[PDB]
Motif scaffolding. Structure first.
Motif, PDB file in Angstrom:
ATOM      1  N   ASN A 101      16.955  -1.031   8.270  1.00  0.00           N
ATOM      2  CA  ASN A 101      17.014   0.460   8.182  1.00  0.00           C
ATOM      3  C   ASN A 101      18.750   0.825   8.170  1.00  0.00           C
ATOM      4  OD1 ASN A 101      16.473   3.110  10.401  1.00  0.00           O
ATOM      5  ND2 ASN A 101      16.386   3.110   8.188  1.00  0.00           N
ATOM      6  N   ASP A 107       5.823   2.454  -5.629  1.00  0.00           N
ATOM      7  CA  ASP A 107       5.395   2.087  -4.245  1.00  0.00           C
ATOM      8  C   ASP A 107       6.345   0.901  -3.796  1.00  0.00           C
ATOM      9  OD1 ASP A 107       4.383   1.134  -1.973  1.00  0.00           O
ATOM     10  OD2 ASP A 107       2.556   0.333  -2.930  1.00  0.00           O
ATOM     11  N   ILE A 134       6.351  -0.917  -1.060  1.00  0.00           N
ATOM     12  CA  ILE A 134       5.917  -2.092  -0.805  1.00  0.00           C
ATOM     13  C   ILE A 134       5.948  -2.935  -2.006  1.00  0.00           C
ATOM     14  CG2 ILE A 134       3.872  -3.285   0.128  1.00  0.00           C
ATOM     15  CD1 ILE A 134       3.424  -0.722   1.931  1.00  0.00           C
ATOM     16  N   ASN A 161      10.935   5.360   8.836  1.00  0.00           N
ATOM     17  CA  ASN A 161       9.604   5.179   8.723  1.00  0.00           C
ATOM     18  C   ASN A 161       9.161   4.233   7.872  1.00  0.00           C
ATOM     19  OD1 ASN A 161       7.025   6.017   7.781  1.00  0.00           O
ATOM     20  ND2 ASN A 161       6.926   7.189   9.696  1.00  0.00           N
ATOM     21  N   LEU A 162       9.961   4.269   6.677  1.00  0.00           N
ATOM     22  CA  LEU A 162       9.529   3.412   5.522  1.00  0.00           C
ATOM     23  C   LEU A 162      10.063   1.961   6.055  1.00  0.00           C
ATOM     24  CD1 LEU A 162       8.829   2.421   2.875  1.00  0.00           C
ATOM     25  CD2 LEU A 162      10.673   3.104   1.803  1.00  0.00           C
ATOM     26  N   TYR A 163      11.316   1.695   6.458  1.00  0.00           N
ATOM     27  CA  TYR A 163      11.473   0.577   6.958  1.00  0.00           C
ATOM     28  C   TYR A 163      10.449  -0.319   7.845  1.00  0.00           C
ATOM     29  CZ  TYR A 163      13.837  -3.008   9.491  1.00  0.00           C
ATOM     30  OH  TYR A 163      14.340  -4.314  10.256  1.00  0.00           O
ATOM     31  N   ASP A 164       9.990   0.551   8.754  1.00  0.00           N
ATOM     32  CA  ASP A 164       9.258  -0.200   9.644  1.00  0.00           C
ATOM     33  C   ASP A 164       7.584  -0.255   8.803  1.00  0.00           C
ATOM     34  OD1 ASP A 164      10.738   0.263  11.685  1.00  0.00           O
ATOM     35  OD2 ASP A 164       9.873   2.021  12.643  1.00  0.00           O
ATOM     36  N   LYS A 165       7.268   0.566   8.024  1.00  0.00           N
ATOM     37  CA  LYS A 165       6.091   0.146   7.369  1.00  0.00           C
ATOM     38  C   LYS A 165       6.356  -1.169   6.374  1.00  0.00           C
ATOM     39  CE  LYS A 165       3.750   2.025   3.427  1.00  0.00           C
ATOM     40  NZ  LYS A 165       2.126   2.937   3.444  1.00  0.00           N
ATOM     41  N   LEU A 166       7.247  -1.343   5.863  1.00  0.00           N
ATOM     42  CA  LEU A 166       7.810  -2.452   5.025  1.00  0.00           C
ATOM     43  C   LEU A 166       7.823  -3.583   5.912  1.00  0.00           C
ATOM     44  CD1 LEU A 166      10.763  -0.802   3.088  1.00  0.00           C
ATOM     45  CD2 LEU A 166       8.561  -1.778   2.166  1.00  0.00           C
ATOM     46  N   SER A 178       6.223  -4.075   8.787  1.00  0.00           N
ATOM     47  CA  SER A 178       4.930  -4.556   9.524  1.00  0.00           C
ATOM     48  C   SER A 178       3.899  -5.039   8.544  1.00  0.00           C
ATOM     49  CB  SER A 178       4.391  -3.331  10.085  1.00  0.00           C
ATOM     50  OG  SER A 178       5.075  -2.831  11.485  1.00  0.00           O
ATOM     51  N   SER A 179       3.992  -4.506   7.295  1.00  0.00           N
ATOM     52  CA  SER A 179       3.155  -4.909   6.146  1.00  0.00           C
ATOM     53  C   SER A 179       3.662  -5.951   5.182  1.00  0.00           C
ATOM     54  CB  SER A 179       2.764  -3.816   5.122  1.00  0.00           C
ATOM     55  OG  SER A 179       3.987  -3.164   4.441  1.00  0.00           O
TER      56      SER A 179
END
Ligand SMILES: Cc1[nH]c2ccccc2c(=O)c1O
Length: 167
Positions: A18, A133, A135, A157-162, A164-165
């Motif tokens: 991030n 997208d 991801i 926010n996007l960093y954490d979603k990338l 985690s997923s």
């Protein structure tokens, strides 16, 4: 060993953080920073507008001369120009812009340009205002780039979603 700090390791060759790419480039002075370019090298917004602003518009001046001589890039293509005050070189890479209706299959071609460089600081291609997208962009990056890529992700926010997923 290299200068990049605070990255999470995703694979043998792909790292993510991030971080503000302008601020990351200014700190590291990498050999190569990747720009999220368009075919006209018009650096108006997103990665392109922020990088160009950080060069005091020198990136845009150089880019205008490049286009006047060579004409537009291809979607999926790239050119190497100066990194100005940010890096030795800037690799301007054109990912497909979904908000212009471009073929997302061209994202793999875009990432193949990274393989011409041993180490790069880069954004996720076709993310942000290019409409893809993120991801998906990270999956294509991992499955396409074989050289060492340090991805800077603008949104926390996007960093954490990338992360985690990530498979
Ligand atoms: C300072 C700064 N840095 C960025 C890095 C990547 C993508 C967008 C931006 C942006 O919009 C902005 O203002």
């Amino acid at each position: 060993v290299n200068s990049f700090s605070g990255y999470l390791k995703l694979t043998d060759n792909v790292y993510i953080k991030n971080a503000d790419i302008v601020e990351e480039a200014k700190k590291v002075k990498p050999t190569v920073v990747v720009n999220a370019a368009n075919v006209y090298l018009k650096h108006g917004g997103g990665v392109a507008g922020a990088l160009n602003k950080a060069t005091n518009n020198a990136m845009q001046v150089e880019s205008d001369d490049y286009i006047a001589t060579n004409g537009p890039l291809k979607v999926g293509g790239s050119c190497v120009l100066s990194g100005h005050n940010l890096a030795k070189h800037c690799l301007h890479v054109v990912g497909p812009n979904v908000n212009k209706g471009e073929d997302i299959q061209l994202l793999k071609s875009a990432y193949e340009n990274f393989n011409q460089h041993e180490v790069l600081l880069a954004p996720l291609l076709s993310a942000g205002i290019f409409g893809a997208d993120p991801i998906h962009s990270l999956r294509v990056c991992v499955d396409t780039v074989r050289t060492n890529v340090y991805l800077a992700v603008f949104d926390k926010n996007l960093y954490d979603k990338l992360v985690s997923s990530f498979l």
